[PDB]
Design a protein around this ligand. Structure first.
Ligand SMILES: C[C@H](CO)OC[C@@H](C)OC[C@@H](C)OC[C@@H](C)OC[C@@H](C)OC[C@H](C)OC[C@@H](C)O
Ligand SMILES: O=c1ccn([C@@H]2O[C@H](COP(=O)(O)OP(=O)(O)O)[C@@H](O)[C@H]2O)c(=O)[nH]1
Ligand SMILES: O=c1ccn([C@@H]2O[C@H](COP(=O)(O)OP(=O)(O)O)[C@@H](O)[C@H]2O)c(=O)[nH]1
Lengths: 431, 431
């Protein structure tokens, strides 16, 4: 049996994409070693059905540990953002344990994420072929690489303009982008990416040109399942159809008090039904404006910490998704046909939001010239998309996009499997 | 590799269910020999994605041939109904070739349909274990067995009453004996194409009556990914949502002119949009009332011969299904959330329509005392269910049933695989 060890970056959204890809490979008779830290392995285990455990085994990666930075913090999930440098540094120091794991398990292939340049190096040292897998979409990467080659010409296939709030240590920023691009550039023959040609094909071809490397899509990768759902479903069961927005900002971002107030007042003014997951950093309710939940009454529900996002998005009473536009959340909303109201925050999210808007399956709540979220913009877009449904074009496009994604089967993985087959056959000769 | 030879009955609906079951087994690393007549293998091949051809091989079964009954007639598909006796006899005369196939390929398991009592006997003579797989639902079988054991008591777990048109000779006994032998002769279990949410109490009753375990193998529903669809799609793309009824009576029934006239007149009175599949026997429009199509205009479409039923049922503009209530068409309609307007014709269809009515996912157009279809009932039910959506209870339960069936996965096959694994381990010792 052909074995693959998979090494996601230490974020929950990365674990998620990597696990869906592992399921696809296990269905093609590959045996998977799924490698991450124990806190991440525990968090993602509920998304692996028992029928897979025979062919997808979890393998614990050890990061350096101290009482100030213990194992339960070896993840971006709910991490204090001022510990993010520690997490990156600790991850790079796990390279020798990673080498021990690769020497012991001797997998035939490594698939690794885009935040660990050391990973393909350890694999090369052991004569193990390694392929990069990206859990973002294509648009953001192509937007990042384009000005390196064309610093005086605009990105040529989209009308998207990145708001100045996100355009705003130059060597360190360069070293981070160099590490990121190295992971892609170092990949054996192809890079894998969680996307599909109907949405990003021309960006795929453009990125392949800039990188001088084939880009292989493997998307849509979307997980489909009481973790608290019984109470949530009972409340949703009492709403009209397409009347409710889910509100969430993912696994590794905490919106500021001022940001929560603009969103909260946006929700209130829209008069929509809403389920809103509010989170607090691991060490640390009152993040919300005074009286907001009371005025909301039966229209509002705040879930603390974590919610069954997929089940909520698939409920008949859900008409919209106020999202930070993390890529898994975007793919999920598209697969389930729920139009997105974009409130992006950082990293790839402003690009994802622009791609959502450009494809016509959602809208973006624009920040003001100070870079602040606007309660009026949030309330307006929820009114048009969800409450009054005057944006019939967006709801239709979202429906049409869901029909497209629902039609995709295991053929979406054929190209990856053939490139894996070719790569191993070539390297077996050379070894 | 463990090998399974599958022998459906020579109907297209039996081929279809058996093929879906073959796919489920291929995904569990079984190798499938799919055995039938060449005219049936040709008919079903477009439903088998190319990725399965390495593990699902087609094996031709030869029936006695004559210029008056040549190979292209070796199927119920569009067969003149007066040739049905010749088809059964010809099927039974293939037992020698079937033995030759079994001796040559030496499969580890036979899965056989319920119209070939000779098939388990041939397997038993070669020490090949054999399991019966029923492509109907359970309701009809338990309704057939119940009066054998309780001739003076009502069927205990339903309100359904069979209309006298269908209630109306040791030869009937001999066919019932042959059917029940196929189930009774099955090794340890019987497989059936149903699910507990709809038929669980009937499964338990059937298991007690037969003194054999009944194993549901779930919603088996083929889903495609042009067969005349682009023209139909363009037509459908221009209707309102949920505005259209698909109309079909399956693979092996030609409604009479009197029935066609009642259905056409019901369709016209409802003023619904309709796509209507009209067929004529293999050898051989004229079957419809004068000017029915011209009066229908662009609201009506008649497809001759065959239609992409699943794609049409999944289309956003399809709001109902005027169906003979073949079980594959019922399962498909339920999976796709399309309420059924029942017009059953013979065999198991009246029972399937009753179950559909019982579940509230569809309605039955009642026949007249002498057995005549009622144009007024056809029109009334299409009016209430499709055109003017006043039967929201049916729509809702149709949507709720589709949500249940959409949530099912590969686990629906766990029980069948476990019993197969046990049966092969037991008979391995005994051989
Ligand atoms: C003959 C079988 C032998 O295994 O059992 C006959 C006997 C136990 O009768 C039991 C009862 C169920 O039979 C009722 C009869 C009306 O059905 C016979 C069937 C052939 O039709
Ligand atoms: O309360 C929550 C919040 C998030 N998610 C899931 O967590 C993942 C978040 O990934 P994403 O790419 O959207 O953003 P990130 O967490 O990486 O910032 C997605 O699968 C969401 O469905 C969830 O199940 N419940
Ligand atoms: O024009 C048609 C009519 C039927 N079918 C398919 O043929 C099968 C019919 O099986 P069913 O049990 O409903 O009826 P039967 O043909 O056995 O009487 C189903 O899968 C239908 O989707 C189809 O593809 N096109």
């Amino acid at each position: 049996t052909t074995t693959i060890l998979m090494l996601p970056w230490l974020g929950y959204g990365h674990l998620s994409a990597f696990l869906e890809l592992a399921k696809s490979l296990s269905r093609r008779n590959f045996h998977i070693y799924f490698c991450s830290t124990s806190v991440n392995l525990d968090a993602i285990k509920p998304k692996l059905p028992s029928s897979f455990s025979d062919s997808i085994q979890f393998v614990e990666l050890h990061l350096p540990s101290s009482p100030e930075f213990p194992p339960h913090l070896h993840t971006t999930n709910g991490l204090p953002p001022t510990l993010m440098p520690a997490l990156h540094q600790a991850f790079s120091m796990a390279a020798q344990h990673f080498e021990s794991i690769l020497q012991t398990l001797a997998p035939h292939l490594l698939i690794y994420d885009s935040l660990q340049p050391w990973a393909p190096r350890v694999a090369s040292s052991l004569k193990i072929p390694a392929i990069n897998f990206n859990t973002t979409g294509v648009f953001v990467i192509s937007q990042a690489l384009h000005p390196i080659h064309y610093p005086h010409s605009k990105f040529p296939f989209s009308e998207f303009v990145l708001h100045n709030h996100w355009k705003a240590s130059t060597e360190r920023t360069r070293k981070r982008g160099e590490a990121f691009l190295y992971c892609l550039h170092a990949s054996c023959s192809v890079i894998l990416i969680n996307s599909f040609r109907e949405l990003e094909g021309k960006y795929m071809d453009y990125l392949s040109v800039l990188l001088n490397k084939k880009v292989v899509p493997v998307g849509p990768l979307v997980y489909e399942p009481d973790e608290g759902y019984s109470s949530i479903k009972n409340w949703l069961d009492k709403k009209e159809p397409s009347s409710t927005v889910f509100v969430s900002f993912g696994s590794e971002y905490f919106p500021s008090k001022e940001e929560m107030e603009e969103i909260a007042h946006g929700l209130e003014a829209s008069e929509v039904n809403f389920i809103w997951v509010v989170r607090f950093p691991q060490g640390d309710e009152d993040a919300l404006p005074k009286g907001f939940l009371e005025r909301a009454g039966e229209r509002g529900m705040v879930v603390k910490g974590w919610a069954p996002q997929a089940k909520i998005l698939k409920h008949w009473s859900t008409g919209g998704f106020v999202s930070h536009c993390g890529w898994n959340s975007v793919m999920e909303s598209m697969m389930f046909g729920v139009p997105i109201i974009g409130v992006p925050m950082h990293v790839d999210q402003p690009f994802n939001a622009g791609l959502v808007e450009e494809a016509g399956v959602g809208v973006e709540a624009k920040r003001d010239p100070d870079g602040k979220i606007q309660r009026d913009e949030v309330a307006k877009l929820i009114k048009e998309v969800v409450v009054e449904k005057t944006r019939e074009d967006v709801r239709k496009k979202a429906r049409e996009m869901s029909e497209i994604l629902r039609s995709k089967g295991e053929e979406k993985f054929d190209e990856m499997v053939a490139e894996i087959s070719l790569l191993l056959k070539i390297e077996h000769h050379h070894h």
